Symmetry: D2
Subunit: 335 residues, 4 copies
C-alpha cells in the first residue's frame, strides 16, 4: 500500500504514513505525571505498527493544562516518567512525538490562573481569562523553550506545537479572540507574533536535525475569524522554520460544524499545495480505503487516526500483506 | 449527503448512488435483453440504488462492442428494453440508458467497423474504415433515433457514451482523429461530432428529462486528452447537458496508477471549473469514501460498478431504519 | 470449504450445503399467484450461489393459507406461474424445492374456513377452528397429493411437507392441540396418523427418484407438548419414507424461547444421530464460520439460512476462493 | 451467556472469554519476564478479557520448551511475574498461570531433558533420560513449589499443562509411556503422575482458588489417547479440579483436519460424560460461534488464542454501550 511508504523528515524516518493523533487520556495525577496506564496505552499502538505516535497535549506549565489530570512537562520529575513512554514506543518500532500545549482561556481547572491575549470567555461555562502583559507573554515563550529542552532529554523524536483547538496560540491567531492594540494584536503579522516567537524559542532548545510540527485550526467557521486563506498567510510566515503542518479546525468558540469523513482534508490539501509544505490530514478517517485515497491523490503526506486507534489499536497490522511484517511474537496470527 | 435526493430537471433521484453502466455480454445477436438482464438490474433497484445506468446500448449494429451487447437500433428492441425499465421503476429506482457506439473498438469480425481516421485501437483490432461526412450525419441521426426509442421505452435519463476509446472519444482525441475536414484539426472541429450528437438527442428527448455525458478526461499520453482539454470541451456543451459522468482511459493501451478514488480529481476539476454537476467513479467501495466525495463537494453522484456486482444491496446496508428496507425484507434489518 | 461439497439425495445433486430456508414474502395475489416480485426474489439467490432454494410455504388449499397474499398450489392454474420461478432458478444453477403447507388453526384470513384437529385457538387473536371430521381429513390428505402432482408438473426437484411452526400437521402431532379421541388422537401412533397419511399420499404423486423433506418443530417448549424424545419417536415412524428432516421448533402456542446463534442445532444433531437420517439445521446462523463448524462436526447435512439471505443474497459467492466460481458476468468483481 | 459471570470457588470471572495460554518466546535465559510481557498481557486486560491465562511457565529449567520461556522455578522470578499479575488485575482481568514441564519436548539442546521412557519426540530432539521413581517425586515437588510461588505472585487460577505432548501427556499416552513400574502399563498407573501433581499443587494452593487442567483429548493415532480414554482420566481427577481446558494433539506429528470448533466436540463430551466444567478452544474467531458454544452448553468458557493476538480488543467490540468501555476510550464507542 502507499500507506506503507516511509517518510523522511530531517534525520528522522517514519516507517509508514500513519500517525496516532494526539488524544488526552485524562489519566495523570494532579502533579502531571504519567503512569503505567499511559505506558501501556502508547506501547499498544507501537506494537500495532503505528509509524508516528503523537503524545496527547502535554502542558508547558500548570496553568496551561486543560484539566488537572493532564500530562505536564514543566519539571524534571515529569521528564523521568515520560522517558518510560518514549523508550518503550521506540523499542517497539515507532517514532515518538510530543504535543507541547497551553490551554490558555480554555483551561478548565477551577483554581488555576487562567490567561489569554484578551479578557473574553471561550464560552458561558469558562472563566474570564486575564489579559497577558508582554512580559508574561515572554515568560510563556520561555516555557515552550524549556519544555522543548525537556522533551529532547526525554528522547522524543518530534516536537509538535499545539496552535489549534481554541487554546492559547490559536487565541492570539484569531481576530475573534485577540483584541489587543499592542505589538501582539491588530495586524496579521502582530497576531502571528506569539506563534513565531514560540517556534523561534523551541528551535533554540531543539536539535536542528529533529522535526518540528505545528497543529493548526484552519477555520473558525465564523465571519471575521480564521479561514483557509488566513491560515495560508500564517503558514507562509513560519514554513521555513517548521517541517509539517498537522491540519485541524475549530475549537475557539462553539459553532455547529458539519461532520463527515474527511471533513478537514480540503484544508490539509490547500495548505500543502499553496504553501508547499508537508501536511497531515485528520478527522473521521477510519478505513484503509479513504487513507489510501488521501495519500494517493496527494492531499496530505501523513494520515492521522484518533478514535479509530482507540477502538482498533492494531489497525496498521491489519493492512500488512505478509506475515514477516508482523511482530515476531504474533506472526502465527497473520491471516 | 448520501441519502439526500438530487433533482435534475423534472427527475428526482432519491439518493446519490448510481449503478455505473456495466456490459453483461448476455444478449442475443439481435441485441435483445432477456430474463438475465431483467433480474440483474431489478436486483439493484431492490437493493436501493438511486439511479440505475444500463450498460452500453448500441445505437447501430456496427456500434456494438460484441454481438452479445444490448441494442436500441430498431423499434423491435423497445418492447423488450421496456421490461427492464418497468421493473426497476416499480422497485424504486430512476432508470437511465447509456447510448453507445463502439467505433474502432467494435470487436465483431463481420461488422462494418468505422472511425474518424484509419488507425487501429491496438494490435488485435480491425482497421477502421474512415467515415465520410454523409456517414457521420447518418450516425448522428442514429443517436437521435435511439433517444426517441429510449423515451418510448420509458427511461428517465439518457447518457451519451463519449468515453473509453469508443466512437465519440475517437473524434475528441488528437491521437485518433487525424481528419483535415470540419471534423478534425482544431479543438472546435474535434468537438463537432459530440456537439451534433447532443443536438440530435435533444430533438428526440423531452426537454424536462436529463441528459448525461460520460467522458474520458485523460488519455494518459502526450498528444491526447488531458483535464484542461476536457474542461474546454465541457464548456462547449454545458448549456445543453445536465451532468458529466467523469471517467478516463480506453483510447489506447496505457499504464494507469490504480487506487481508490483515482478519477475523483478529474470529477472535481470539471465540477469547479465548468460549474456543472458531475459523477465520480473508479475503485470506490466504501460508504466512508462515498460520503467524503459527496460532502467535500467533489461530485454530485457517486457511481459504483464492481462493488454493486459483488454486493448488490450495498445501499440497503447504509440505511439506519427498517422502514427504508423493502417491506418483504424488514425482518432482516440489523 | 466443507460448505462447497455436493450432497446427492436420490437422483438430485445439490452442489453445496447451503439451503435458502423457506420464507413467506406475503406478495402474492388473493388468488395465490406469484408475480415478477417472486421471480426476481428467488432468481437473485440462485445467482447468489445457493445450492437448494426452498420456496416459501405454498398452500395446498385456500383455507390452508396463513394470509391472503400467500402462494398457492391448490389448482392447476397456479402451475404455469410457479413454473416461471422453477425455470429461472434452475437456469441459474440452483436445485428448486417447494414447501407444501397448510396453516390449520393458524390461518389468519378472517373469512376462510379455519380448521384444526380440535376446537382450540392458537391464541387470543385467532379464529376458533372447526373440528375436522375423518372425511374432511381424508380430503386434506388428497389435497397434499394433488399439490405434489402439481409440483412435479411445475418441475420442482424436492418437495417439503410443512409439519412445523404450529400449522395443521403440527397441530395433530402435539398433545397440547390434539384432544381427539378417534383414530387421529389419544396415542402417539394415532397422533402421527395424519402426517403418515400425507407422506404416503405425496409419495403416490411424487416420482420415486426425487427427495421428500419434512420440516418439524422438535420442541413446543411446554410441559406436555412435543419434546426431542417425542420427535425422535415420530421421525422413527417416517424415516423409511422420507429423505431429510428440516429441523425447527416452536410455533404451536406463544412461549418465551431463549434465542441465540444455533439455538435449534442440537435438535438437528440429535435427530440425525438417534434416527440415522439426514437433517438440515436452521436458526440465527449468519457466518461462514458457524456454518462450517456445524457441517464439519457432522451436526447436520445441510445448513439453512433465512434472514441472512434476505439481507445478503450473495452470501455463498462471498465464500468462493476463485473468480471462475462466480457467474461469468460478475467475474471482474471477485476480490 | 457471553457476558455472564462464572464463579469458580471464590474467584468470579466477569465474562466467559479466556485468553488461551500462548508462549511469546521473549523471556531471558533466566526465565525472567520483561516489559514486553507486561504490555502484551495488560493490552488484553484493557481489551476486556475475563480470564487471562499466562503462557506455559516452566516449573524447572529443564521443563522449558525453549530458553526464552518464562519460568517459576525459583523465588527470584516471583517479584517479576507479580508485575504482570498486578497490571492485569488492576485493569479488570482474572489472572491465571499455566504451570508447565516440557518433558521430552524440551527444545534446549544443552538441558537435562527427561521423560517417562527413552524415546525422542522427533529426530531433532535430544534422547530423554528415563525418569526414576525418585526423580518423578522431585518433579511432583517442583509443581508444588511452583504453585506456592504462583500464590505469592498473586495469580487467581492455576492450570496444570497436561497436554500438547509435554511431560504429563507423555505419561498419559501409551504411545510415549513404555514403563513397567507403578507409573506405566495400566490406565491407573499412567494417570498416577498427573494425580500426584494435582495433589501436590493442592497442598500448595489456597483451597478457595481454582485448579484447571489442560489435556490433549486425542493423539489421533491408533493405540494413543482418544476421547474415551480421556473421559476415564478425567473421572479420576474430577473431584480434585474445577475445570478441564480441552485441547488435542502434540505427542507425535499427525495430520489433523482443521476447521472452526474442531476441538469443541471433545469439550462437550467431557462436560457431559464427566459432569465437570470445560473450556473450548481451537479456531474460534467470531462472537457468533463463541455464543453458540456457550449457549448450547458445549463448554463453560471459550478460549481465544490467535484471534486475541491479531484483535486484542475482541471483547470490547461485543459490548453494546459506551459505559462498558474503558473510560479513556468512551468517545470511540461505535
Ligand atoms: N487537547 C485537545 O486539542 C482536545 C481536547 C478535547 C477534545 N478535543 C477536540 O475538541 C472538540 C470538542 O470536543 P468535546 O469532547 O469537548 O465536545 P464534542 O464536540 O466532542 O461533544 C465542537 N468542535 C470544535 N471543533 C471541532 C472539530 N474539529 N470537529 C468536531 N467538532 C468540533 C472535538 O473536536 C475534539 O476532537 C481537543
Ligand atoms: N463499454 C465500456 O465502456 C466498457 C466495456 C469494457 C470494459 N470497460 C473498461 O475498459 C477498461 C479496460 O478493461 P478490459 O477488461 O478490457 O482490460 P483490463 O485492463 O481491465 O484487463 C486498462 N484501462 C483502460 N482504462 C482504464 C481505467 N479508466 N481504469 C483502469 N484501467 C483502465 C476497464 O477500465 C473497464 O472498466 C469499459
Ligand atoms: N410459514 C411459516 O412457517 C412462518 C411464517 C411466519 C414466521 N415464521 C416463524 O414464526 C415465528 C414467529 O413469527 P413472528 O415474526 O410472527 O413472531 P415474532 O414474535 O418474531 O414477531 C415466537 N417463536 C415461535 N417459534 C419460534 C422459533 N422457532 N424461533 C424464534 N421465535 C419463535 C418465528 O420464529 C418465525 O420464524 C414462520
Ligand atoms: N506450549 C504449548 O502448549 C505450545 C507451544 C507451541 C505451539 N503449540 C501448539 O503446538 C502445535 C504445533 O505447533 P507448531 O506451530 O510448532 O507446528 P505447526 O503449526 O508448524 C502441525 O501441528 C500439529 N498439531 C499438534 N496439535 C495440534 C492441534 N491441536 N491443532 C492443529 N495442529 C496440531 C499438527 O500435527 C501439524 O503437523 C500447534 O497446534 C500449536 O497450537 C503449543
Ligand atoms: C479523547 C480525545 C482527546 C483528544 N485530545 C487531543 C489532544 O490532546 N490534542 C489534539 O490536538 N487533539 C486532541 N483531540 C483530537 C484528535 O487528535 C483528533 O484530531 C480528532 O478526534 C479527529 O480525528 P479522529 O476522527 O480520527 O478521532 C482529542 C480527541 C479525542 C476524542
Ligand atoms: C464488466 C464491466 C463492464 C463495463 N461496461 C461499461 C459500460 O457498458 N459502459 C461504461 O461506460 N463503462 C463500463 N465499464 C466501466 C464501469 O462502468 C466503471 O466505470 C469502472 O469499472 C470503474 O468503477 P468501479 O471501480 O466501481 O468498477 C465496465 C466495467 C466492467 C467491470
Ligand atoms: C419473513 C419470514 C417468513 C418465513 N416463512 C417461513 C415459511 O414460509 N416456512 C417456514 O417453514 N418457515 C418460515 N420462516 C422461518 C425461516 O424459514 C427460518 O426457519 C427462521 O427464520 C430461522 O432461520 P434464520 O435465523 O436463518 O432466519 C419465515 C421467517 C421469516 C423471517
Ligand atoms: C504462538 C503460540 C503459542 C502457544 N503456546 C501455548 C502455551 O504456552 N500453552 C498451551 O497450552 N497452548 C499454547 N498454544 C496453543 C493455544 O493456546 C491454542 O490452544 C491454539 O492456538 C488453538 O486456539 P486458537 O485457534 O484460538 O489459536 C500456543 C499457540 C500459539 C499460536
Amino acid at each position: 500500500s502507499i500507506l506503507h511508504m516511509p517518510l523522511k523528515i530531517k534525520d528522522i524516518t517514519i516507517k509508514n504514513r500513519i500517525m496516532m493523533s494526539p488524544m488526552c487520556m485524562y489519566s495523570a495525577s494532579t502533579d502531571g505525571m504519567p503512569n503505567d496506564w499511559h505506558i501501556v496505552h502508547y506501547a499498544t499502538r507501537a506494537i500495532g505498527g503505528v509509524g508516528l505516535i503523537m503524545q496527547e497535549a502535554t502542558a508547558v506549565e500548570s496553568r496551561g493544562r486543560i484539566t488537572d489530570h493532564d500530562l505536564g512537562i514543566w519539571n524534571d520529575e515529569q521528564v523521568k516518567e515520560l522517558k518510560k513512554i518514549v523508550d518503550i514506543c521506540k523499542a517497539n518500532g515507532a517514532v515518538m512525538g510530543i504535543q507541547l500545549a497551553h490551554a490558555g482561556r480554555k483551561c478548565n481547572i477551577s483554581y488555576e490562573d487562567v490567561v489569554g491575549p484578551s479578557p473574553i470567555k471561550a464560552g458561558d461555562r469558562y472563566k474570564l481569562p486575564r489579559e497577558l502583559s508582554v512580559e508574561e507573554i515572554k515568560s510563556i515563550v520561555k516555557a515552550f523553550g524549556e519544555a522543548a529542552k525537556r522533551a529532547n532529554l526525554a528522547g522524543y523524536d518530534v516536537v509538535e506545537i499545539h496552535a489549534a483547538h481554541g487554546y492559547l496560540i490559536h487565541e492570539f491567531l484569531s481576530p475573534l479572540s485577540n483584541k489587543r492594540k499592542d505589538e501582539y494584536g491588530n495586524s496579521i503579522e502582530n497576531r502571528a507574533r506569539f506563534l513565531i516567537e514560540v517556534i523561534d524559542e523551541v528551535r533554540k532548545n531543539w536539535p536542528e536535525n529533529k522535526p518540528i510540527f505545528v497543529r493548526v485550526s484552519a477555520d473558525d467557521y465564523m465571519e471575521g475569524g480564521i479561514n483557509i486563506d488566513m491560515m495560508v498567510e500564517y503558514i507562509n510566515m513560519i514554513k521555513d522554520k517548521v517541517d509539517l503542518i498537522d491540519v485541524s479546525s475549530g475549537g475557539l468558540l462553539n459553532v455547529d460544524i458539519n461532520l463527515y469523513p474527511g471533513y478537514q482534508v480540503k484544508y490539509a490539501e490547500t495548505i500543502k499545495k499553496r504553501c508547499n509544505i508537508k501536511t497531515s490530514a485528520v478527522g473521521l478517517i477510519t478505513t484503509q480505503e479513504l487513507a489510501e485515497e488521501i495519500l494517493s491523490n496527494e492531499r496530505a503526506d501523513l494520515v492521522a487516526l484518533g478514535r479509530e486507534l482507540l477502538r482498533n489499536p492494531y489497525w496498521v497490522l491489519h493492512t500488512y500483506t505478509s506475515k514477516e511484517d508482523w511482530p515476531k511474537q504474533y506472526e502465527r496470527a497473520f491471516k
